[PDB]
Amino acid sequence: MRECISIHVGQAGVQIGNACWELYCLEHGIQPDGQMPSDKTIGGGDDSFNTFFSETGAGKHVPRAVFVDLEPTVIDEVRTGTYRQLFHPEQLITGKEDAANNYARGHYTIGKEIIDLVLDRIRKLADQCTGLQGFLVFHSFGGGTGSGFTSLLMERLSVDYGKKSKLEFSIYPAPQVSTAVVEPYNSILTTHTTLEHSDCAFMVDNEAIYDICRRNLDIERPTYTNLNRLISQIVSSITASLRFDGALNVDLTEFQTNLVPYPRIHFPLATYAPVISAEKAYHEQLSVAEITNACFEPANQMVKCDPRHGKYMACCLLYRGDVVPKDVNAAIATIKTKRSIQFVDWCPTGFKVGINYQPPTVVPGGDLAKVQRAVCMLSNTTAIAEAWARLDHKFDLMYAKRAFVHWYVGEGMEEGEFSEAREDMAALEKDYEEVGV
Amino acid sequence: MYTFVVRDENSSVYAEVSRLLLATGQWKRLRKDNPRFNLMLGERNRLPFGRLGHEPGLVQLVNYYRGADKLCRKASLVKLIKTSPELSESCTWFPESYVIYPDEREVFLAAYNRRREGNVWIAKSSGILISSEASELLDFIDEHVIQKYLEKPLLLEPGHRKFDIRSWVLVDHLYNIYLYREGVLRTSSEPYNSDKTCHLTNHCIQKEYNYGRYEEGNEMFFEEFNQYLMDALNTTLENSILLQIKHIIRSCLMCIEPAISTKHLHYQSFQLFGFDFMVDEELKVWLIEVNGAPACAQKLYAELCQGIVDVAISSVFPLATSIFIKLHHHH
Amino acid sequence: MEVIELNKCTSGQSFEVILKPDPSLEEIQKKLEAAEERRKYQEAELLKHLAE
Amino acid sequence: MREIVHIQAGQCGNQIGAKFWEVISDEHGIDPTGSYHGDSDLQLERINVYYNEATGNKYVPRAILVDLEPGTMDSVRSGPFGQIFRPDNFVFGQSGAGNNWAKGHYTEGAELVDSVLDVVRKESESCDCLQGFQLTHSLGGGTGSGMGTLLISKIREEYPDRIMNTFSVMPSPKVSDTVVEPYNATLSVHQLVENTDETYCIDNEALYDICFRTLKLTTPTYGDLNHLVSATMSGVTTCLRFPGQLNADLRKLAVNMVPFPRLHFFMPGFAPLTSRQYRALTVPELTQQMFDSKNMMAACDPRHGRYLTVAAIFRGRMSMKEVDEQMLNVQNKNSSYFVEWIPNNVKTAVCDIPPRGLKMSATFIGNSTAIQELFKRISEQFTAMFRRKAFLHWYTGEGMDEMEFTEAESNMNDLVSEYQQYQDA
Numbered sequence A: 001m002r003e004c005i006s007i008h009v010g011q012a013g014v015q016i017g018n019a020c021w022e023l024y025c026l027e028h029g030i031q032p033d034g035q036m037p038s039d040k041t042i043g044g045g046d047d048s049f050n051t052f053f054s055e056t057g058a059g060k061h062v063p064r065a066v067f068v069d070l071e072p073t074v075i076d077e078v079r080t081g082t083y084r085q086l087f088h089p090e091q092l093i094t095g096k097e098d099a100a101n102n103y104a105r106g107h108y109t110i111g112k113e114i115i116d117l118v119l120d121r122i123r124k125l126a127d128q129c130t131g132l133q134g135f136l137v138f139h140s141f142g143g144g145t146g147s148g149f150t151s152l153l154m155e156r157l158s159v160d161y162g163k164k165s166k167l168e169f170s171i172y173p174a175p176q177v178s179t180a181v182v183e184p185y186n187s188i189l190t191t192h193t194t195l196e197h198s199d200c201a202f203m204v205d206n207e208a209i210y211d212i213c214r215r216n217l218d219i220e221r222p223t224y225t226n227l228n229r230l231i232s233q234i235v236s237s238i239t240a241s242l243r244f245d246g247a248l249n250v251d252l253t254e255f256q257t258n259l260v261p262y263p264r265i266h267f268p269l270a271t272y273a274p275v276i277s278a279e280k281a282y283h284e285q286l287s288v289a290e291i292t293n294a295c296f297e298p299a300n301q302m303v304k305c306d307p308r309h310g311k312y313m314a315c316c317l318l319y320r321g322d323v324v325p326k327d328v329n330a331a332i333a334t335i336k337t338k339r340s341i342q343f344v345d346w347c348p349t350g351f352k353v354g355i356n357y358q359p360p361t362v363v364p365g366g367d368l369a370k371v372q373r374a375v376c377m378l379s380n381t382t383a384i385a386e387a388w389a390r391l392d393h394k395f396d397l398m399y400a401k402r403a404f405v406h407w408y409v410g411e412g413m414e415e416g417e418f419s420e421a422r423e424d425m426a427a428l429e430k431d432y433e434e435v436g437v
Numbered sequence B: 001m002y003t004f005v006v007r008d009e010n011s012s013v014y015a016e017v018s019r020l021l022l023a024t025g026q027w028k029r030l031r032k033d034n035p036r037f038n039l040m041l042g043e044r045n046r047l048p049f050g051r052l053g054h055e056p057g058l059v060q061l062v063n064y065y066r067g068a069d070k071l072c073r074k075a076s077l078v079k080l081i082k083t084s085p086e087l088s089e090s091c092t093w094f095p096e097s098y099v100i101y102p103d104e105r106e107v108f109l110a111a112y113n114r115r116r117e118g119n120v121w122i123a124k125s126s127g128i129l130i131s132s133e134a135s136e137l138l139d140f141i142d143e144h145v146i147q148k149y150l151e152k153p154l155l156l157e158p159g160h161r162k163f164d165i166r167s168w169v170l171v172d173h174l175y176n177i178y179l180y181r182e183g184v185l186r187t188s189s190e191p192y193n194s195d196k197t198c199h200l201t202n203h204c205i206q207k208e209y210n211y212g213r214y215e216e217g218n219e220m221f222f223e224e225f226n227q228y229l230m231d232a233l234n235t236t237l238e239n240s241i242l243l244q245i246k247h248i249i250r251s252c253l254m255c256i257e258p259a260i261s262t263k264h265l266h267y268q269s270f271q272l273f274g275f276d277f278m279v280d281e282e283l284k285v286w287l288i289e290v291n292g293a294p295a296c297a298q299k300l301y302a303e304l305c306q307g308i309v310d311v312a313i314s315s316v317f318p319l320a321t322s323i324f325i326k327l328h329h330h331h
Numbered sequence C: 001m002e003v004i005e006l007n008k009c010t011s012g013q014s015f016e017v018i019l020k021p022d023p024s025l026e027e028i029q030k031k032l033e034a035a036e037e038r039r040k041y042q043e044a045e046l047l048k049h050l051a052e
Numbered sequence D: 001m002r003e004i005v006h007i008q009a010g011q012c013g014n015q016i017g018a019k020f021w022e023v024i025s026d027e028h029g030i031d032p033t034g035s036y037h038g039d040s041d042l043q044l045e046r047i048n049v050y051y052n053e054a055t056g057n058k059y060v061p062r063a064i065l066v067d068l069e070p071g072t073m074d075s076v077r078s079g080p081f082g083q084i085f086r087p088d089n090f091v092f093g094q095s096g097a098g099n100n101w102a103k104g105h106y107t108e109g110a111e112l113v114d115s116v117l118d119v120v121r122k123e124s125e126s127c128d129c130l131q132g133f134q135l136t137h138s139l140g141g142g143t144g145s146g147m148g149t150l151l152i153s154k155i156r157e158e159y160p161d162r163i164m165n166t167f168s169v170m171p172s173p174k175v176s177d178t179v180v181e182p183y184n185a186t187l188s189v190h191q192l193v194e195n196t197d198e199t200y201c202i203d204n205e206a207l208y209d210i211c212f213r214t215l216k217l218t219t220p221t222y223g224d225l226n227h228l229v230s231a232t233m234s235g236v237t238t239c240l241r242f243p244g245q246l247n248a249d250l251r252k253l254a255v256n257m258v259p260f261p262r263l264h265f266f267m268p269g270f271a272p273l274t275s276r277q278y279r280a281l282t283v284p285e286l287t288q289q290m291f292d293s294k295n296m297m298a299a300c301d302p303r304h305g306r307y308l309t310v311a312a313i314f315r316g317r318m319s320m321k322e323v324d325e326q327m328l329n330v331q332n333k334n335s336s337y338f339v340e341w342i343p344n345n346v347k348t349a350v351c352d353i354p355p356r357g358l359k360m361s362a363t364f365i366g367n368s369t370a371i372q373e374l375f376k377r378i379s380e381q382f383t384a385m386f387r388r389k390a391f392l393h394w395y396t397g398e399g400m401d402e403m404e405f406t407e408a409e410s411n412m413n414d415l416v417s418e419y420q421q422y423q424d425a
């Protein structure tokens, strides 16, 4: 058994973190106080759930998580929330003034003064791990702390934990819920600085989650609570292989091996189905073939894009619920003909399939209907570069007039880092083009 | 009030459509780089489809299908028919063709020797050489796809001359396939000498290398062609040719529908196509090529462009007898 | 269509179907201290300006 | 706790400042005695931004009152909420400034600024995490204009890393006290350009027109003008005073609204402006009124320029889904008036608690290049007198020389030019 440590940075990461650990506790039968009746090994053990939860002599299963934010209001929700008894005070770190949607403020000004405190808290959790696989970092692209402090932390983790894997769950900015006009700057600034330090990053576009909530869940104006409950489901299906008994994606290294042949192109696209409104009195239960087919509908992807006009480098299917391999193979064969699936010649044309028999867990009183089977597909397609191009175009328009640039220079950042970050993204876009067309 | 942008100043068709949109008093044209648009009359090459459908509150429509180039490239079409089961290599309405990288050289030779064992081919790409010797064609490419040359074309009389048929097809966001009622024949003013002015029916060749002697601009419209078939051959355009054209159009578009459809996509697409058909002396129709950004006959600009606004643009953005034939297909 | 590496357990099973055959700590400190220096220089000029 | 320190200086600044605290004190349930008597937890949520807590659960505004004559400040102490202000935070002189920028900035103000900075230091010292200051003043007089900008310069020197925000009343001949107002306004604008991060430009010309044309007030008074300003000041500070996601503090507001350091002068706007009023407005009506010039209080026409950034705040129980639709409608209908090189430069916020006496309202904050018209208007009036050196003796008698006037005019002409270049980008 090897432990995984979760790090939540900024408002988006912290609020998403709270949603996931609510789901994790439900999935593993852990009560808010931390007690776990089904765990007969009191105060110890190397079970699968021990990857994400340590145990105390009192029998409390304490998440291997640390929450960090430059403002205290969001992490104070955890301190007094339903799962307040789950975490101990050392795990929650807050400053007094935030990065003001300014990457330079989060990275240099405020980050430099708080980084050593965060690393010291992470060291406390690391020293309690017999073998540490690596870290899972949750954060927004657009926030000043989410972008600026995360890039600093990722650099330091690569120093103090060089042989450890680092995976990302990143929130891509969307104007329908965006809070700042300079988010394109921060997204590119943090992507450039973090690119060499992340082995695998899962981008979730708030645009996609927003439309899925309005359309599938009949929510007129989705809020963060709606968005995070859905996002935690996708995160749960991604991390389930680390928390349960299984043979697929059992450690963070395997995520790199199965999904990222090219180290720079480490942004798999996630497609999830079915998303069913809980308000429906009775819901038709979709079959294995039906949900597998929905994995190739753009309307169910975490990032809006058209994989039909890209190339695949790897594809993974993660099923939860009443699924048997026979039905998966039949569904794959059917789709493999009708659907437009174009791999690259330097990769095998296949699917790595994982089935967990426990069907998805629905947070009581949530918006998602309890289904009998679900699937999340992780496909490293070049189509996801459309998200980079959209972001890069907005960066170009503002940077041609140097709009808002003075805010970053005023924090000690050199203007050259803007162009240096942009050139990297241009190189990244070229890399996708060289592999997909 | 609907908004649109123009990103192809060289489009004779959508320049008229742009003129019509403003003539409705309900469409506002924006700067070519303004992203808060409803309709895009985008550029032919490198159209940023990836920036479409990401504007909250804006239904965005574009006049091109992403991926439709596969059907509108000399080699892409050749490969598409061979490797597509719906079209198959046994396709009866497409001339035997091979892709030759300056590769299917070996296969082309196998058939070429089997024929000499009519053996004339035409080499073309995106400069055309018609030769009865494989050496001349193969060398020309290296100095392209080699396609069988129809040595028995149907020749109009008087004139004993070659021609081709241009069909305009509009595909809307719902993927209905519309065929404009008015077609055009691009005849060769020179008698078919089995020099290339009589073999090549291209308008520029006729107007550059007898032009206009028989029909104005070597352009014969359907009514005259239909009357000729009734007189010369005791038949109609619909029965002898038009049924084969609608079959060919539907097959090509149905084949790629799953690849280019925008049924559940964050943006919508429509596109106008130009189909080029050859007719042999047996009254069999052959597909020559598919044009992705076609022009129109001057007499037909008004009716077609208004129809484009009607079924393609006003169907998604409504204002305050159809000229098209709806080729009824299935999902 | 081939199915390989089938693993079964109580919780579930997995398989594979084939359809066709860094900067040092010192360098980070320099970056952070360089930025802090530029902030200190810009503040000093402002205070110098206000002193005038 | 991110606290804001409020300063109000001079006659205009203290009358508008007093009304502002009267308005928001009601919105937070704070009565004239400093006791909370509200019913919603949202009231006390972020009360610490503007109020301190005292013995007996008393809430005391974090406000400093400054003037060179006791006249106006005596009125405040006897006004509706006079007893709510901390007596120590009253700092006043006796000479007056005689509507003279030089007196407020160089001779009479200089004698009193230090005791004001001592009060500011005392409030800041007890701030958990001070975010910055907000100043209420006029630019046309002597104390608010001349001493107010002197205070800003000294506050910036002692707190160089904090945010400086002002509400600045622009003079207009239509509502004028003396002919030297353009001189005083021009001298202050340069101070503001250099030493503030956010300035709400409140034009008395616009306030008068709204009272006369829209509100149907035949003979507007300063009280009627301040009714508009109180409502505006409440709207633009909603994002700071109640829970929310957008522009929650002064620094984030600056980052979203100020693309270039010198261009930080905002056109405020309020809807509704109904005369005599029980009829509820629809979301389409609030939005269209909010973007109409007649609802804007800077006396500039937005259609004569382009918006760099826009902030909209909706208050009351309304359809948020409909609010997004209406805001998206406005931008897409008039996309020619928003610069294309700052994508998604319109940010919308909603607050459940509506202003007193209204079921819903909309507050508009725009950084438009059309504001150059307001500075052009002042520049013309300044030059008309300065070419003949008229009324300059009032200023040279206090130690100023003509060269300082020449620079101030030149600096503002540059400001207009900078606004013009970005209007053609």
Ligand SMILES: Nc1nc2c(ncn2[C@@H]2O[C@H](COP(=O)(O)OP(=O)(O)OP(=O)(O)O)[C@@H](O)[C@H]2O)c(=O)[nH]1
Pocket: A009, A010, A011, A012, A013, A015, A016, A070, A071, A098, A099, A100, A101, A102, A106, A139, A140, A141, A142, A143, A144, A145, A146, A147, A171, A172, A173, A174, A177, A178, A179, A183, A206, A224, A227, A228, A231
């Ligand atoms: N999906 C989702 N997105 C969020 C959430 N909270 C914020 N965001 C997005 O995150 C971006 C803003 O970044 P934040 O994380 O809020 O900023 P921060 O990390 O706290 O950094 P600061 O600037 O210091 O406040 C915007 O694009 C928001 O849409 C959330 O709870 N769920």
Ligand SMILES: Nc1ncnc2c1ncn2[C@@H]1O[C@H](COP(=O)(O)OP(=O)(O)CP(=O)(O)O)[C@@H](O)[C@H]1O
Pocket: B095, B122, B124, B147, B148, B149, B150, B151, B162, B163, B164, B199, B200, B201, B202, B276, B278, B288, B289, B291
């Ligand atoms: N396989 C073939 N057999 C017989 N004639 C052929 C032929 N391929 C082409 N042609 C003749 O040569 C002409 C030119 O062919 P082609 O279609 O390549 O020119 P083009 O691509 O420019 C048509 P357009 O001007 O519509 O784009 C055709 O119009 C036809 O008359």
Ligand SMILES: Nc1nc2c(ncn2[C@@H]2O[C@H](COP(=O)(O)OP(=O)(O)O)[C@@H](O)[C@H]2O)c(=O)[nH]1
Pocket: D009, D010, D011, D012, D013, D015, D016, D097, D098, D099, D100, D138, D139, D140, D141, D142, D143, D144, D145, D169, D170, D171, D172, D175, D176, D177, D181, D204, D207, D222, D223, D225, D226, D229
């Ligand atoms: N809106 C408004 N403007 C005022 C008020 N009092 C004065 N003014 C304006 O402020 C300018 C005069 O400055 P004033 O505040 O009296 O000078 P000070 O006391 O030295 O700061 C003139 O342009 C007046 O029109 C007021 O109560 N409301």
Ligand SMILES: [Ca+2]
Pocket: A039, A040, A041, A042, A043, A044, A045, A046, A047, A055
């Ligand atoms: Ca145990």
Ligand SMILES: [Ca+2]
Pocket: A158, A196, A197, A198
């Ligand atoms: Ca590494």
Ligand SMILES: [Ca+2]
Pocket: D095, D111
């Ligand atoms: Ca004295």
Ligand SMILES: [Mg+2]
Pocket: A010, A011, A071, A098, A099, A143, A145
């Ligand atoms: Mg924050």
Ligand SMILES: [Mg+2]
Pocket: B289, B291
């Ligand atoms: Mg062609």
Ligand SMILES: [Mg+2]
Pocket: D011, D012, D141, D177
């Ligand atoms: Mg006065």
